[PDB]
Scaffold this active site. Structure first.
Site, mmCIF file in Angstrom:
data_model
loop_
_atom_site.group_PDB
_atom_site.id
_atom_site.type_symbol
_atom_site.label_atom_id
_atom_site.label_comp_id
_atom_site.label_asym_id
_atom_site.label_seq_id
_atom_site.Cartn_x
_atom_site.Cartn_y
_atom_site.Cartn_z
ATOM 1 N N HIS A 5 -22.182 2.245 -29.425
ATOM 2 C CA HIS A 5 -22.983 2.796 -30.522
ATOM 3 C C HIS A 5 -22.963 4.320 -30.497
ATOM 4 O O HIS A 5 -23.194 4.949 -31.528
ATOM 5 C CB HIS A 5 -24.382 2.174 -30.627
ATOM 6 C CG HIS A 5 -25.380 2.691 -29.638
ATOM 7 N ND1 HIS A 5 -25.617 2.065 -28.442
ATOM 8 C CD2 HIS A 5 -26.187 3.772 -29.659
ATOM 9 C CE1 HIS A 5 -26.574 2.691 -27.791
ATOM 10 N NE2 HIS A 5 -26.926 3.746 -28.497
ATOM 11 N N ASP A 63 -21.962 -2.983 -24.945
ATOM 12 C CA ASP A 63 -22.115 -1.678 -25.573
ATOM 13 C C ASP A 63 -21.483 -0.520 -24.753
ATOM 14 O O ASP A 63 -22.156 0.217 -24.024
ATOM 15 C CB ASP A 63 -23.617 -1.461 -25.835
ATOM 16 C CG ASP A 63 -23.848 -0.403 -26.917
ATOM 17 O OD1 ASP A 63 -22.858 0.305 -27.268
ATOM 18 O OD2 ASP A 63 -24.971 -0.317 -27.374
ATOM 19 N N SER A 95 -29.020 6.590 -24.313
ATOM 20 C CA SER A 95 -27.879 5.751 -24.537
ATOM 21 C C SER A 95 -26.631 6.361 -23.927
ATOM 22 O O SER A 95 -26.408 7.565 -24.094
ATOM 23 C CB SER A 95 -27.631 5.477 -26.004
ATOM 24 O OG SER A 95 -28.486 4.333 -26.304
#
Ligand code: ZN
Ligand code: ZN
Ligand code: ZN
Ligand code: ZN
EC number: 3.4.14.-
Lengths: 697, 697
Positions: free
Chosen positions: B62, B200, B633
């Site tokens: 992402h 991810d 992230s």
């Protein structure tokens, strides 16, 4: 783990029982009238147990719901409020049909039973009648002792027969029910689900005459004095601990042809569910208007809800585990297996063939058969057909009367006609008759019933409407008229201008003929079932798989340990729920409306000496890998020393398809912890008198 | 456990780190340019890390999504298909604005910053301008060395200031991305949720000139040679094990007035969530009919989905913990405690009153201010206003140009105008313009803007359509026309008949006046915020609470242990998920449509040498009690020996309210296991070249 073991399998399960943690000797469990097993009693479709030397019996709230509902009105709702009797003189009758059965003896009668069956040779219908006649004579001899009722059980497809003999206690009284927001917390939303937070318990007391012998209700009766009763555990139950259940599971279908399964999945369960939901919707509406209809139909309503959700859950569980798939594949593999061994395995292969065609036969008429059955099960048509049939049977010698219509069945017949008063509202039944007529007319022309067609006068709203208007004139709506006809003779029935009774007289020939058609099919089944099922069993033993008979309402033992399960990756359900979990579900609206006393006691951490340190609260419900089914409700859960740790009451959602295909990973019993029983009775809806009588306060 | 600890707090967490299981010495963690901390890099809104000596960088999918999307077409969709460069020459540019920042140095400049502010005297606007000029001079001096970018950070409401110097790598290339159905398995349905089954991750490579110095993209650049990089763990990560994260969390609001919380929960989050959802609906619907819109708006749509769902989760979490009530009682306690201290508490009390008044000044125009901002953020009006603003700033000396419009910002401006080519479709942006126009018109009279009212010249559906037809005449839809305007001077903008330019010229005085207002309020805040937030800190310390600053995009350390959480009674989430869980979710429809090679490999039990025997499978994602938020992230998760065991990517649903009120029982990090990265790159979307380069080949 898997198995609903007959008490005669105790040597097979001795070692497994020790390894799982039983600290009683297998000897001691084998004594079915000993400590603790002699404390376990059958209610008739639920289990219970004695828990004092004065006849105190504990079972589930939903097992007692019948009785509590029979004692409830709109203006005094015991379902809603609970019931407590501060003295034994305060206890109210549970109803004329309420029973406690206390095991006395089991005897194998296999050899004799298959002799009688064989003695009729090659005629299907005669084979059925000969078994019927054998059973009746057996039971007649066994019940010659006053106060005992007996029963014949066929196991493993007819490969074994045993005769059970029970003391029949016929005066059962309600002693305590917690309010319905405890007894049935979470209602139909939490039914068949975990996490569960339900206090599903209630107490009866068992009464006999002053001569110590069973008697029907009278104010001169006194409490039965059981030989054996259960003691509450003194060690706290925790995750991993040994538990066991003894009780009376009703039916399983684990030995079955794949076609039996497909039929059930694709037809039986969807149809029944739909019908059940439709009647729920009707009754729900009318009861929102009408508290009398609401209280009067509550038991029926709980039944329809419970079975329809169960079948929804079975259908989902089949898809989850591909049960259609597995059944196909074990059938192929067993058919494979059999020809496999040529000469020796040819009896079994023939059987398979017969069974399968019998089943296409019952299949041809299945819509007819269901619809007529349920149409005749509405209140006034049920009452008239039963009562007319009884008048027919009373003309024969008792030994030849149909089971359900012999002298031994009169108490229950008369009892049902009086109980119906608390379960019948004519405006409600009219709508159910309407519902079922509408479904009848719906039937295809080949699937119709001559006599019903004619009774009706053709296939439309108009005829339906005429029917309903006519039936409305019955006097069978009052208990007194029903009890009049209970005693009347066949000629009086055939003379009657009551329209319900006229319906019965009109259709009874058809019903008797269809009963013959069923007895004939069963007789053919009786030859072919035991052979084929014996081969199913033999294959399983050859795969090292567990071998025990499908449930049949007889006493079984299951054992295992306290453990949760994992429905999906990344999650697990814990073995216990807790008091704080009850209050987290609180909405102040039914079914999540706990009593104020519970809410306050929990917010205060008033745990009453009952906290389990390991979970930091008082336990409410718990999961275990026992193997139970409908009929096990109310069964006591015993620990490694045979002490009472809870009551069985439900299964988790993913478990219910195990009726057909057993899945060890998702099959759990849900039980109410005996510490929650205790806690509710100390802090919420107190019964200091029962606690003291159970030596726990 | 709780805490986004600044590196300078290592002395205070040394003990707790060791108790949790850290086996590296704390001084080894103190070296921010050493092993392993010198491996951790910032991307600008995400974190990453080096994992080879040849400049290989791992982050989340992402995080790289922007870059994958920029290299995607309807015809050749890398989001869908994945990307794999078999040699370093096959790597594609991540885009002109992609960055890797490598920590060089941190300096405390608190004393000089506070002196610059104090020199400005009583006037709030001069205080802002004095801190601005302070920052700009500091930054220009620090960036005197070619290839470095510097950033000034304010901590704890302006009680501490630090300057960070980073090596600024400006040629970042995409080296590998799994297929989107791995990288975003479960899509927006599983976003913010556990159980989670999302691979991810993605890889970049960092490039510099042949002379070793940062450079924009060129074929002559060669891979950067990092001083430090991470190594994959050789020990299997298990439940309970120590983990720590270093990264760059963006912002938290744990020190906040109760009124700031109230306004956010009551107005800010619902309002923005609604607006994002309205725009999602339009873009989704349009993208169904036009695969160019669908690919061009995918990164925009991922942001709106993520934020609006986050906001829904915070609001639900506030209710679960009664955050409103908690904020109310803490502030009553702090203000009590202050009043408590007579004279010496008075400056914090007055600071509180001032901060509350400034919140009220903001609130008075919040609708106007949000609506005007987001209207002007559509693609053509955004470009027109940004570029027109640039032409104004360009006429001042560089030191006096607004931040964002100085010479050092020119590469980012220009790069944005190019990237937009892959993110703009006129017919889509027209519908967003229309949405914001209809929202604008709903504002009441005191919240309207004269310049937009005049430009619109009406207040109805007709005026809205004429305005849209007028704007559709812009030529800014093309990259070359945007770059023309990037270089053009102010009079050229003011002469233009481009309708978007004309809009920009018309509203610019108003945007500048509104900016002055916000600078004035900021300057008042500069005086009051450090005093109240110091008081808040001192109060927390007196209660023995953890004391660490809110996130502010600077480097933080969090640590703890692998563990699940209990979301309700009777249930626990386990710390890991597994491969069979991915497949259990498979529907063959987005977002639950794994690559066929994944489904095959799991079916075949090809675990690739990566099975953790304790869970019976290859782990996919896991939970831990670390304290992360937006900007973390892509942060590496390190084990006790500083080896890589996963990447941070998300938080569970109940965690997100921790931005305001920290809840230890339900605040967990979701991370993708390094073994699942490896497994995908073995069995599913193979990259043997990168496994070899990371020596796990
Ligand atoms: Zn013991
Ligand atoms: Zn009469
Ligand atoms: Zn031009
Ligand atoms: Zn070690």
């Amino acid at each position: 783990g898997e198995g609903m073991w007959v008490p005669q399998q105790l040597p097979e399960i001795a070692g497994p029982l020790k390894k799982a943690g039983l600290k009683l000797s297998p000897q001691q469990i084998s004594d079915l009238t000993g400590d603790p097993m002699g404390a376990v009693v059958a209610l008739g479709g639920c289990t219970a147990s004695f828990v004092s030397p004065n006849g105190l019996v504990v079972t589930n709230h939903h097992c007692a719901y019948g009785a509590i509902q029979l004692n409830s009105t709109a203006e005094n709702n015991l379902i809603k409020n609970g019931f407590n009797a501060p003295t034994t003189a305060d206890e109210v009758s549970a109803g004329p049909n309420a029973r406690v059965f206390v095991l006395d003896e089991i005897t194998d009668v296999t050899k004799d039973a298959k002799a009688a069956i064989a003695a009729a040779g090659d005629d299907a219908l005669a084979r059925t009648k000969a078994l019927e006649a054998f059973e009746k004579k057996l039971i007649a001899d066994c019940e010659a002792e006053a106060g005992f009722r007996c029963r014949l059980y066929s196991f493993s497809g007819g490969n074994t027969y045993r005769l059970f003999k029970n003391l029949e206690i016929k005066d059962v009284r309600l002693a305590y029910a917690p309010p319905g927001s405890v007894g049935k917390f979470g209602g139909d939303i939490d039914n068949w689900m975990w996490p569960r937070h339900t206090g599903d318990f209630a107490f009866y007391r068992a009464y006999v005459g002053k001569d110590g012998k069973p008697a029907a209700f009278s104010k001169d009766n006194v409490p039965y004095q059981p030989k054996h009763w259960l003691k509450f555990a003194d060690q706290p139950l925790g995750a991993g601990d040994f538990v066991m259940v003894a009780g009376y599971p009703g039916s399983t279908n684990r030995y079955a042809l794949a076609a039996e399964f497909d039929n059930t999945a694709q037809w039986t369960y969807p149809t029944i569910a739909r019908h059940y939901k439709n009647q729920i919707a009707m009754v729900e509406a009318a009861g929102k208007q009408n508290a009398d209809i609401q209280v009067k139909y509550a038991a029926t309503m709980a039944g329809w809800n419970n079975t329809s959700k169960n079948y929804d859950g079975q259908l989902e569980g089949f898809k989850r585990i591909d049960a259609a798939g597995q059944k196909l594949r074990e059938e192929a593999a067993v058919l494979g297996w059999l020809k496999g061994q040529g000469a020796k395995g040819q009896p079994a292969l023939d059987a398979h063939a017969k069974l399968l065609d019998l089943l296409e036969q019952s299949k041809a008429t299945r819509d007819r058969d269901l619809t007529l059955a349920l149409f005749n099960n509405t209140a006034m048509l049920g009452s008239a057909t039963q009562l007319y049939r009884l008048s027919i049977e009373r003309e024969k010698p008792n030994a030849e009367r149909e089971s359900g219509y012999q002298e031994r069945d009169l108490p229950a017949i008369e009892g049902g006609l009086k109980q119906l008063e608390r379960r019948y509202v004519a405006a409600m039944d009219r709508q159910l008759q309407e519902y079922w007529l509408n479904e009848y007319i719906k039937l295809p022309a080949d699937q119709r019933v001559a006599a019903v067609d004619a009774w009706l006068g053709g296939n439309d709203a108009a005829a339906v409407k005429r029917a309903l208007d006519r039936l409305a004139g019955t006097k069978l709506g009052s208990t007194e008229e029903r009890l009049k006809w209970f005693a009347a003779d066949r000629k009086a029935f055939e003379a009657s201008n009551d329209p319900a009774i006229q319906y019965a007289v009109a259709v009874m020939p058809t019903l008797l003929k269809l009963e013959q058609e069923r007895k004939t099919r069963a007789g053919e089944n009786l030859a072919a079932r035991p052979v084929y099922l014996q081969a199913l069993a033999d294959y399983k033993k050859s795969q090292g798989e567990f071998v025990y008979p499908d449930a049949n309402l007889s006493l079984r033992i299951t054992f295992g340990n306290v453990m949760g399960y994992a429905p999906k990756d990344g999650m697990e359900y814990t073995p216990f729920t807790t008091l704080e979990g009850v209050v987290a579900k609180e909405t102040g609206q039914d079914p999540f409306d706990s009593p104020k006393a519970l809410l306050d006691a929990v917010a205060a951490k008033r745990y009453g000496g009952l906290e389990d340190k390991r979970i930091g609260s008082v336990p409410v419900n718990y999961l275990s890998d026992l193997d139970i089914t409908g009929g096990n409700s109310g069964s006591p859960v015993l620990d490694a020393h045979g002490k009472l740790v809870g009551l069985a009451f439900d299964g988790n959602w993913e478990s219910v398809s195990s009726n057909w295909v057993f899945d060890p990973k998702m099959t759990r019993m849900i039980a109410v912890d005996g510490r929650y029983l205790r806690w509710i009775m100390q802090e919420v809806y107190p019964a200091p008198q029962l606690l003291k009588e159970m030596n726990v306060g």
